[PDB]
Amino acid sequence: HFGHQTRRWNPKMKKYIFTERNGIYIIDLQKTVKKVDEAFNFMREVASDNGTILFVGTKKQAQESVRDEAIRSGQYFVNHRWLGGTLTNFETIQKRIQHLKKIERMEADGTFEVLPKKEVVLLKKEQEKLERFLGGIKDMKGLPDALFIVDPRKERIAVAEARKLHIPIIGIVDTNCDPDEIDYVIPANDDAIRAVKLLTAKMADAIIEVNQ
RNA sequence: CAUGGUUGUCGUCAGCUCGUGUCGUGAGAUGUUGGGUUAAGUCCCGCAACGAGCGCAACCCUUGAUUUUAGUUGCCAGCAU
Ligand SMILES: [Mg+2]
């Protein structure tokens, strides 16, 4: 399967090139098979306790894929910017959670109107801006028991903070990326639209098989 | 030039900070920079930061038009004197 140019590759993935071609490297699919075996097994073994599982899709080409798998799988996700402090500053992110909860309870259950225009002026624009980040994780009460990423080159903050928390992380890696930070890495290109979906399908099946 | 309290002053300038987080051996930084915009760290997009406080703004008084209430010590149109 494809990779990225020979101009900016990472030698940590010498294990994973296979039979290169015009400008772009290609990946050892059998290695990929074994890695997805370990990762699928481990995802199932993690979520067998009904844990909390977080997805990252900060990259354009996998926003939609991550979102679709996450809504099908009932486990939390992110696609817009990674708020620096998601899990380290989780206290204050959870303050923001409580705030959003208060707003959407105040609009319907408590009194909707207390000001003359402030509701549709500011409260709704703010609630848009909150959903523009918090997405799925609004109902993630505790920390994750495991994390999925799609591009540890783009998503280094999420990777780094999960590492500091010693949360187990997993994720696809293009040739530019670095697996040594990842625990149960999967070699594959992350810029194509079909493949990232094709992997998160299996990795959401892994949790759906056992959330029951 | 021991002090309180009161006061000018930079300057009604838009700035000064902080909890948690992160980077840095560390002091420190981040946030508070940037691109725009605004009278204004005002507000939006973006960002290893997310948020908050003091300030800014607004709530106050006054002036600027008008409705209802009340019409004397004010007013005088329609009226006589
Ligand atoms: Mg003021």
Strand B nucleotides where any atom sits below 7 Å of a protein CB: 19-23, 44-51
Structure tokens at A100: 């959003």
Nearest to A151 by CA among A79, A56, A80: A56
Distance CA A207, CA A73 (A): 7
Distance CA A190, CA A148 (A): 13
Distance CA A106, CA A15 (A): 55
Q: How many CB atoms lie within 10 A of CB A172?
A: 27
Tell me the technique behind this structure: cryo-EM
Give yes or no for CB of A124 within 7 Å of strand B.
no
Number of H helices, E strands in chain A: 7, 6
Structural contact between residues A182 and A190, judged by C-beta atoms closer than 8 angstroms: no
Q: Is A36 helix (H, G, I), strand (E, B) or coil?
A: helix
Beta-carbon contacts of A166 under 8 Å, excluding residues fewer than 6 positions away, are none
Structural contact between residues A130 and A99, judged by C-beta atoms closer than 8 angstroms: yes
Q: How far is the CA of A53 from the centre of ligand 1 (A)?
A: 48
Angle, vertex CA A176, rays to CA A187 and CA A164, nearest 5? 80
Angle, vertex CA A197, rays to CA A21 and CA A59, nearest 5? 80
- Maximum CA extent, chain A: 67
Structural contact between residues A26 and A18, judged by C-beta atoms closer than 8 angstroms: yes
C-alpha count within 13 angstroms, C-beta hemisphere, residue A182: 25
* Rg, C-alpha atoms of chain A: 19
Q: List the single protein residue with the shortest CA to C1' distance from B46.
A: A81
Distance CA A60, CA A64 (A): 8
Structure tokens at A207: 């949790």
CA distances, A30 to each of A21, A64, A156 (Å): 18, 27, 27
Q: How far is the CA of A123 from the centre of ligand 1 (A)?
A: 23
Structural contact between residues A53 and A209, judged by C-beta atoms closer than 8 angstroms: no
Angle, vertex CA A60, rays to CA A171 and CA A66, nearest 5? 50
Q: DSSP label at A78?
A: -
Q: How many CB atoms lie within 10 A of CB A174?
A: 23
Distance CA A51, CA A75 (A): 9
